[PDB]
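Students often ask what a holo structure prediction actually looks like on paper. The answer is less mysterious than it sounds. You provide the chain, you provide the ligand, and the output is a string of C-alpha cells encoding the 3D arrangement of the protein together with 79C.
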Amino acid sequence: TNQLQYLQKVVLKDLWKHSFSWPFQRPVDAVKLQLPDYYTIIKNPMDLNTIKKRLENKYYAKASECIEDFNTMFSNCYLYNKPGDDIVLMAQALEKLFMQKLSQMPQE
Ligand SMILES: COc1cc(C(=O)NC2CCN(C)CC2)ccc1Nc1ncc2c(n1)N(C1CCCC1)CC(F)(F)C(=O)N2C
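The corresponding C-alpha cells follow.
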C-alpha cells in the first residue's frame, strides 16, 4: 500500500488540483458530448474519479494496476482524438506532471 498510498495521497491529489484536469474528473459521457463511436473505439473507459474511488475502496492490490489505469485514461484520449486538439494538449500536460510526481514515488 506504500506506493499505493503515494499514488492516492500525492499523485492523484496533485493531478486533480490542476485546473485543466477538469475533462478527466468524470467518465466521458459520449451521448451528451455527441461522440460518434466513442464506445466502439474506447473499450476500457477510465477517468480520475474512478481511480479515486478504486483507491478509496482498495480495489488495487499492486501499484502497477493503478499506474495502468492512469495510462489508460491518457491513451484513450490520444487514440480517440487527434494531435494538436485541445483535449490532447490537456492530457499531454497532465501526463508530463503525472510522470514527474511518479518519478518521486517511494522505491521498491
Ligand atoms: C464536461 O463536458 C464537456 C463540455 C464541453 C463544452 O461544452 N465546451 C464548450 C463550452 C465553452 N466554450 C467556450 C467552448 C465549448 C466540452 C467537453 C466536455 N467534456 C469532455 N470530457 C472529456 C473528454 C472530452 N470532453 N472530449 C472533448 C474534445 C472535443 C469535445 C469533446 C473528447 C473526448 F474524446 F471525449 C475525450 O477524450 N475526453 C477526455
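Residues 63-80 form the longest helix (18 residues).
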